[PDB]
Amino acid sequence: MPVLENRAAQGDITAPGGARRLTGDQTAALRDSLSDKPAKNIILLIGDGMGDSEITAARNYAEGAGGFFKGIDALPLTGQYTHYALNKKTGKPDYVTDSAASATAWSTGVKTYNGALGVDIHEKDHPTILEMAKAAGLATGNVSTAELQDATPAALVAHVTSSKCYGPSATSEKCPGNALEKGGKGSITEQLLNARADVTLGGGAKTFAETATAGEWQGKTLREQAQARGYQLVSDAASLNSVTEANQQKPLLGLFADGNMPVRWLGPKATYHGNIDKPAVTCTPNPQRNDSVPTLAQMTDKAIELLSKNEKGFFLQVEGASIDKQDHAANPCGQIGETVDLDEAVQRALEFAKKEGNTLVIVTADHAHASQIVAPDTKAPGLTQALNTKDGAVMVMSYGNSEEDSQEHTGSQLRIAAYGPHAANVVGLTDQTDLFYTMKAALGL
Amino acid sequence: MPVLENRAAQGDITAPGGARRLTGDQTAALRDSLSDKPAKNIILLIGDGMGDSEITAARNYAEGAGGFFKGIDALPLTGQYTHYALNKKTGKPDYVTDSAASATAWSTGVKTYNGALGVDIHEKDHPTILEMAKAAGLATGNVSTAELQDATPAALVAHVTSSKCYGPSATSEKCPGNALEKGGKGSITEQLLNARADVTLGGGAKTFAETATAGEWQGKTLREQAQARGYQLVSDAASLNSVTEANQQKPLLGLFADGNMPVRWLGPKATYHGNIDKPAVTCTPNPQRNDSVPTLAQMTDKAIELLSKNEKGFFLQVEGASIDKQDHAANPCGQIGETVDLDEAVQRALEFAKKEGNTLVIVTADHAHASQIVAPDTKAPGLTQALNTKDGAVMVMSYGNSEEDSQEHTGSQLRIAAYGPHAANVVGLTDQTDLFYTMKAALGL
Ligand SMILES: [Mg+2]
Ligand SMILES: [Mg+2]
Ligand SMILES: [Zn+2]
Ligand SMILES: [Zn+2]
Ligand SMILES: [Zn+2]
Ligand SMILES: [Zn+2]
């Protein structure tokens, strides 16, 4: 089963045929990309807020307009999917999802209301793909550059009526029906610990310093609970690297930041008339990010390594979470940098999948976002920035959909791409909830 | 070769699985969708400015979030393609194309600068796919809801250094190298009459009132010239319908409006804080549109009827031009109405292609645009509007990339979809110029 090896511009983009990404007919290559044998493993990679615009902008800057993402762009089977949520009262569509309702959709196969994690509009719990994988004897992995309590990772492990229910205090206040001391299953962090994926890697160390109000581990911080329950805790690159096994006897929990993990690139925030009155920007490495903090690729590496020891197979989710957060912050360098960071993780995933040959790799986003690519001389009403790209030309980005401090999600359908067994099920128009049923059928759960 | 029959939500979108668009595994159907036999015919349908956003907004409004465009969404093979232009001075990428540069890319296989038609950055002419088709004995059709001099239909039949060169007068002023009296090939309209497609249908009667400055038909209107050269002129739906043949002896020229053809739906323009200050809008049919004006689907139908008589095959391009024009105008109803208009035309194309069996249908856009779907309570700096959708819920659209009176194109990659022989060549990441080569190779040109 082939990967797309090189769909860069093949020539002189100014000459006839020089911008072509194809060197010949694709019918045979695509025939060869279609198998309905069982997936042994799945790797799902989510660029949070990574719409087609975010992919294009990132490619334009980092690789040139005619360049090629050896990870993101390399998956042969592509479609567009819909990620609309539901209004909680009416059950009618709500055309722009948040991260919680969208992650709930691919992870349980039920649509839900903005802010819901692993529950439906009736607040009824539904099983997640990770829970099902594990129940079937599969190894399970949950990796993110966000706090692990954030919606995308949390959706695989927690069932709560509001995604703000990070730890015991939040939960008692905002999700009283989920609060442990009220007879509920507990906060997001408490539920994550109960779920006991083999491998869990991200930020969100700070919520683990809260103490439980009830239950078996009442009166201990959640970290202590984790330790008392046999988890291996690591906090940096070197300690992650040292881990040699992860399973149900010795699950791995990696906590790499108090909150979200730091982004890799620095650049200024976009500003009003920024493309006109401020110089073109070149992104630079983020000086506030220590090399000791593992990258998404490094996290993804170790996770594959440890999960792949399972004879029966694994489920792994990997989230480039700060594409979204930097898009909210109108920061093109931040956003682009996190798209590049995700492309690196996709590369590791496909290289693994290629050699093993029974692994379904999926790359998409939870919803679209604000950023747009506009003409260099645009006079726009929102925040803009000129950037010096790999091509040696200026690209302007625009953030035009919020007068408040945060730019907003958008509701456009967006790219979903796949490689490997059952990848066909991503092609054409689908819904985010199909992804659940695709993964479930692929793994035979 | 199957068409996607029904990818609407399959059940109760509030219940598990109810929002699925798929009813089972797609590997078989997709395999059955892959053929490398020759395309006898090609029907290329362009929604001008119809990015994924535009598709989604139109689906949400007209069919509901979980609805299904029986034309647009029914093509089984899907990918995302890049449409960047070139800076004429540098030859480097210009990340946001106009309609002229993009149409030149698929019609010719060469990238070019914004505003160029059938010429490269050096202002050298390159042959178009329609010209090549004609050369090989195939029937040729060129259909648009725009002025026939507008960029998209013009790119098939005209080679000019500026897309503004509608007729003799503009050409002498702005493309003196192309001016007939200066020894050039002529204005866009003169070159369209030389190209002599079998079927040409659109708007743009105005420029035909001009008289030529030189050549055999000096002093005659370009309308008189068309008639002196054996063209059959039609002007409304009944006259179009009564045409029984179109060929090189009697080429068909349909001029249904003085400028662009009138749009199908009316609604108010989006305004600053429009979603907040103005009630939700319901689009209505444009009561100023005479029913004697053929719709795009009616023009498509007649074109297919006439072109399909050629035993060797045909090439037909069909453009839903006013998606772009209404997006520029921040008019959600006009925009969505034109996307619905296009979907009707696509259904005609697919219906023909399914029975005929050797016809490749391609549906895409020239570039992306401004419109975004945003949360109903968004407070945005640009122009917004709340719409009452078919779901019985409010959608808000936003136009946030220009302070001037035209909303701007955007550079995001966007959906391309195909059905029929060689439709594989649209899947994955491609470039707009690959489409040229795909069409060329499919017809053995
Ligand atoms: Mg997230
Ligand atoms: Mg056009
Ligand atoms: Zn998100
Ligand atoms: Zn967000
Ligand atoms: Zn256009
Ligand atoms: Zn335009």
Tab-separated table of N, CA, C and O and ligand atoms in Angstrom, chain A residues 48-49 98-99 102 152 324 366-367 409, ligand 3:
chain	number	residue	atom	x	y	z
A	48	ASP	N	-5.968	20.389	15.910
A	48	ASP	CA	-7.129	21.055	16.433
A	48	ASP	C	-7.243	22.389	15.671
A	48	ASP	O	-6.282	23.163	15.634
A	49	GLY	N	-8.401	22.614	15.046
A	49	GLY	CA	-8.638	23.824	14.288
A	49	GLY	C	-7.947	23.814	12.935
A	49	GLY	O	-7.889	24.849	12.298
A	98	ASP	N	-17.533	23.376	19.240
A	98	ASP	CA	-16.331	23.556	20.005
A	98	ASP	C	-15.530	22.227	19.938
A	98	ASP	O	-15.921	21.266	19.239
A	99	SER	N	-14.426	22.161	20.676
A	99	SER	CA	-13.528	20.992	20.574
A	99	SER	C	-14.106	19.761	21.266
A	99	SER	O	-13.769	18.619	20.910
A	102	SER	N	-17.137	18.013	19.137
A	102	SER	CA	-16.452	17.393	17.999
A	102	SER	C	-15.637	16.134	18.404
A	102	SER	O	-15.842	15.080	17.834
A	152	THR	N	-9.889	17.533	23.777
A	152	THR	CA	-9.614	16.556	22.759
A	152	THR	C	-9.157	15.248	23.409
A	152	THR	O	-9.781	14.214	23.127
A	324	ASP	N	-5.045	25.302	17.091
A	324	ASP	CA	-6.284	25.979	17.484
A	324	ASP	C	-6.025	27.173	18.404
A	324	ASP	O	-6.551	28.280	18.184
A	366	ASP	N	-10.781	18.778	14.230
A	366	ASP	CA	-12.114	18.793	14.879
A	366	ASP	C	-13.110	19.801	14.294
A	366	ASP	O	-14.339	19.630	14.413
A	367	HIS	N	-12.600	20.856	13.643
A	367	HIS	CA	-13.434	21.892	13.032
A	367	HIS	C	-12.489	22.859	12.341
A	367	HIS	O	-11.258	22.803	12.543
A	409	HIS	N	-13.729	29.676	15.919
A	409	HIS	CA	-13.946	28.532	15.090
A	409	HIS	C	-14.874	28.907	13.933
A	409	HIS	O	-15.674	29.848	14.032
C	3	ZN	ZN	-10.894	22.395	18.486
